[model samples]
Target: RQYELVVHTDIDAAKVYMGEMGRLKSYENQKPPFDAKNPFLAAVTTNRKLNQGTERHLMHLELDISDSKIRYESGDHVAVYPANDSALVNQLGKILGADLDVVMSLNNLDEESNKKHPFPCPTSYRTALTYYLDITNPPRTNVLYELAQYASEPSEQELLRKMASSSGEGKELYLSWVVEARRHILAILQDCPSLRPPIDHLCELLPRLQAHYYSIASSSKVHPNSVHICAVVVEYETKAGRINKGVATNWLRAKEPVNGGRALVPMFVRKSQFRLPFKATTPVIMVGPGTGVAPFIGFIQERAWLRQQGKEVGETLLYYGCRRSDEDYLYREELAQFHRDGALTQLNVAFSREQSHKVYVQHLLKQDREHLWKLIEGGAHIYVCGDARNMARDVQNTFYDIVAELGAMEHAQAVDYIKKLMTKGRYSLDVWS
Candidate 1:
């Protein structure tokens, strides 16, 4: 016997149904047809390096979305569903002794369930490992409980159980070993060979592979059938000597489109509220450093397009920061050309490493307080896009400092002024941690 209400529904299905309900309210709600479950397989048009002479590899990528119905604006994002590294997937298969090529469907136990499988089932072990499950993320404490249950050795089981317990020592151990080390589930299983959890159980426990979002670095007006992105290929060694790589960027770096064709990338569009003012005559002050300058590039492209159309363009100020002008300054020539063409009214850059003292965008803002204050007084929209942890906060504080000193207001009044700017949508930010 079962209750009348449905139970044990797939978690992903629950989210999808919830999203569908929200979309049902508006007939004119514009969104991409593709989603997490059904992503557009876009072809790679360009994948090239944007910077050199530095350990950080800055990459510029373009995708041909002419075949898909996906449309995007200058400030919108593209969500990429990247595959897991094959080596890690192979290691997992080897450890489990599972038939990598055996295809089997994973049906939901609930007969009345709307969804058939968590992922595209009737799939092989290799496919599931590579495409569906999230084995790279640190597993939750509950996963430790499961591992403890599966561990054959009593001592190993006790240790796992102890780590998963609600004790201070358990918390400390988990933080140091799991969170601090950036450990993945595969490593856990590799270390604890006594635990032999079923593949089905592992699949059920692991989360789905999440999509990585990037700011579109090209304008739709300029390139109607293509989308461009700028990203840094993240690779580093942890303190424990384990090499780590950014799942999406590394996957993208490997995509080589040769002979007018290339690898297919699973992607979808994500609309954003970060956009230029409706009127082209409205002035803008943009502060974006590193890859944060991605959307700004699109904005400049749109401005250039507008100029080409003989439309009246407004004053645009860009304050960008990078490590070194020669090392990692991205799109250096393009930005210079944009400035020369008057698409960008003023282009100020801070090369932190080139000088003896480190100078950031916030420092530049402080140095140009009088001019910045004048721009604000003249109805300039201030936009900041970059690191949220330190850079964004510091930039905001610099704004407050300028307003407080130049506007002849108290600290509280300056805070209120900034709040009013935000309320009016004049001060906006698109930042990431």
Candidate 2:
């Protein structure tokens, strides 16, 4: 906005600036921090379990973006803004001995300096816990070191220093405390009861709330007003039977759309390089196991819509795997329908639990090596998604083996061939730890 300064100087200038600052700005009411600075508040139209009767949980969520003009592609990702659970939040409030509802704002020392506030100003401490601060996420080793200042117990101080140090013993100590024990910030607050510091110190030590990125699972062309995501709720047991749950996934699962609970999701689209081939006739091979199959769902959906438009959609091949056919075959009916409708050219499955020996998508890939080589010979784009630690790496290795065995090539030649495919954007991966 521009300010006009008349010839009268001081009095008129004061009135001009105060007039502008007196009322609410038009931009403030339209939408919130639309990007990382602001996130569009989207309604949760659908949040349901994709798998039932099992400890493992895979969820399908539909975040309604109709009210907000959140534009995105089918292959993009959504960064969901999440908060800590009330049990954890209240426990921290009591431990810290600070008023949770005290309203506060950041004060930058230098008038025109670079250091800035992390979130918007004038928010209550409880509001910060609810929206800004990540109070109960995994704690970093540095945070452990910084927390030593508040430790009055000598034994607790020793353990804290040992974990904070970067030596070999320190690394192992940290692994024991954080990894093996599955200790979160809340766990530490209780473990070291004497470690109480100023509210500002705790605020400084805690990191900002992180967003969860979920691969887009619905075609924008088919569902323009909504973006869908598939997530597996993380649950695991650690030392002393401490049950730890995934921050974002559990928060999403716990939110009740039944009434008017925490049903709104703060979100923004994250553009990605993972995409289908440019040419419609180019064949595509997708390897996604479990929740990894999310993106391929969108791909096939878009392919079906394209075919309906009289476009020459190419061959689509999908390799999906699960523990059991009856228990955890994600999108089984939809996938079968796609194949029956001729949208999917090939569909393969590996049920690990159904067989005596464990089976996986890699096993299916090895069995269909000849047919896969034929697809590559005819020019096809390859996509890999899901678990990066084991599944994705194993699949990549299988790709190398197929090139060597079926392509009639040497080891070095096969390695070069796979590299060329990746360099040309013919091979892509979207795996997460």
Candidate 3:
């Protein structure tokens, strides 16, 4: 076969020039923050989970950006800004023995200051410390060693050196009790007379608070004007005398009170790569527990919107587990309604604390192997969300076991199949620490 090149000499440069001019004008007038009406709020939300024979609290966040006119699709995320706790602020303020209102200018130690510091200039030291700095956590070994150089008392200096030098017991003691940034400063003031770090030293040691991201659980198709999130408050006691509360969760749950006892959180949307199958009729199996069910709510809402528009609705099977059915069954009534209306094909719920022998989502999946196998045979998409620790890993292993037993495949083959599903986007995950 022979081919010939074809070129058109009638191209109009004037039309192209006009289009470029219009684009440049639009670019010049664009908003700095894409969602100006809904700016990101810095806060944390927490949930309590019994994991690996321990009662562990998980921290999540709800971002409020009501002022920003940003829009998000399904599977999108929102990043939240976090502030320091009042207790830490008060402790540090006490150590300085300085008026919180006194303004102190901060300068970067290195050229990377512009990229690192989150706040702008012309702000007070107190405002920056309370709202912009991260100082509640325990100091690293290296940071403690460096701070020892400026220690006033021999005992305080020795403690810092021992903590930095020792590996097992001393390191644990430092992490567990003595060396939390706020606690260490408070202890030093009590033990060492007339020992206070100068403003320059404070700027060098402290780090700016970073923004954290969470998956958005609301769909614009259902709630057009506002976004919705589900979060649990995290509170627990460590070896330290005081209870450690997640910065974002306590701020939202206790401080940012809203109409329905909820907080008016700040947030902006992040588009997600994980999405539903192209064919609306494809079956889906979602495994989520506690607040992990957030994104699934958005998914179901989107599916319901599609059905309302006379489009095909897929068969959805949700495997959800929680500690208690009464106290923590989030959105139970809404889920029941969805089930009654045929929006949800199957709802598998597991309550761990209801019986003497605690049952988890993985156990429930094993018990319902036949149904799970049928769904997998029918090309159902599998989705898992929530804690990245044991829950996600265990649930994944359970699926492999089921595949091996039911599908009559070797363990390695089952693993390979799961890997293939993930590679092909049939299996999706969204998680955080």
Candidate 4:
């Protein structure tokens, strides 16, 4: 009775079963990229700052329509569908020498003869290219080999052969040049004008668009009309001579808002292995830095709502850190209000830029070991959210260190204690890259 029934939103329902039906009839009938009944907009919200001082970056996001409807428990993730960049799309059309509005049929090489394509009948080639297929990344080696048959020139055929056969510089060049779907194709076309491949062959080589996921940052009990998400726009220079931006993150940031607000991003919920402690009065500790603070907002909001309904509230401690106290202290006023209202019992913030040494959330955790131990003695739950690389791992190690030092347990035993807490749901995480 501890767990609730799993509810599959209409969006997930379509995603789960639509692939088979769409693939079967794709050549004969082309369907829209999105599901009809589960139609959702990709809505842009705000451009928020993520880090402090020199490390700060911008995060732009679109919230899903389903996010406003369903109540996602703490630690759940929201999956989003990212669209192809317009510049890339235009460039790809030029490479294929195809009209932007031309209609085309797609045959599935993997399908049986009796089955039809997955989508509705008669979709434009542009629609299929934009919505149904993925053209941003490079095709696989095998696909490149197959596509070589349609090469218009001997040089192009030789290039493809070398790329597939050679494991050294040729392989690296293929990965660097032709592997990225649209970008690669566009670049190749720019450099090699004589190497045009047929449109039919290109269609056979490409795959469909894929969805990305983010941690849901708001709780339904507080904001019923909207859901929140935190995403950092990723920008880095690739060896291909162009700056590569994260596909989903950049699209969410750049798109215009819709539905009387920011653009509603196409999204669905993925259940998490994280939750609040079963006992309403149990104490809790949360360590979230940067975008990791997202789910903790939901946690605080849930507790605030519960308290408003006369539910017993317990000691809630947050160990949050960022670069500065001024620009990137996310939800600063709101969190302060939560503390004042007793929803958050204690807030220990470590502003790394406030001092000479760069202090972090784990350092604050170490500074407050006594309080942490006391909370743990009372069965307080522990949660860590954010990047998985160093922060989450270091925080866990810090916890073990606390247990070893304070509880006087051996190192192995201290680790076991933390593991036991996780197994029993006393410790939980909602971490990502």
Best by lDDT: 1
lDDT of 3 by residue, 195-234 (tens): 5665435644666655556667767777555555666666
TM-scores for all candidates: the values are 0.89, 0.88, 0.79, 0.79
Order of the predicted models by lDDT, top scorer first: 1, 2, 4, 3
lDDT of each: 0.81, 0.79, 0.64, 0.69
Q: So what's the TM-score on candidate 1?
A: 0.89
All candidates: CA RMSD in angstroms?
5.9, 7.0, 12.9, 8.4
lDDT by residue for model 4 (1-433), tens: 1111122322222222222223433322433443422434535555455444445454534354433345456677877666667777777777778665544344444456452443322444455555556665656677667666656788887787777766698787776566543345556566556666755456545676777777777776676545677777777665667666677778776766543645545555678887777777988899998778888888898888889899998888888887778857877877999999999998888888878988999998998999898788679999999889999999999999999889998999999999999998999887877
| lDDT value for model 4 | 0.69
Q: Score residue 330 of candidate 4 by CA lDDT.
A: 75
Model 2 lDDT tens row, 1-433: 0111112222322222110111222123446436654566677888888874486888888888886777777778998878767777777878989776565545455546564444544445565666567765567888888887788998888888889989899899888877678788778878888888655556656788778899999998898889898888988886846778777999888756663554777778989999988887899999999999999999999888889889998899999998998888888888999999999999998888997899999999999999899998788999999999999989999999999999999989998999999999999999999
lDDT of 3: 0.64
**Model 2 root-mean-square deviation:** 7.0
Clashes of each: 0, 3, 20, 37
lDDT of 1 at 161: 87
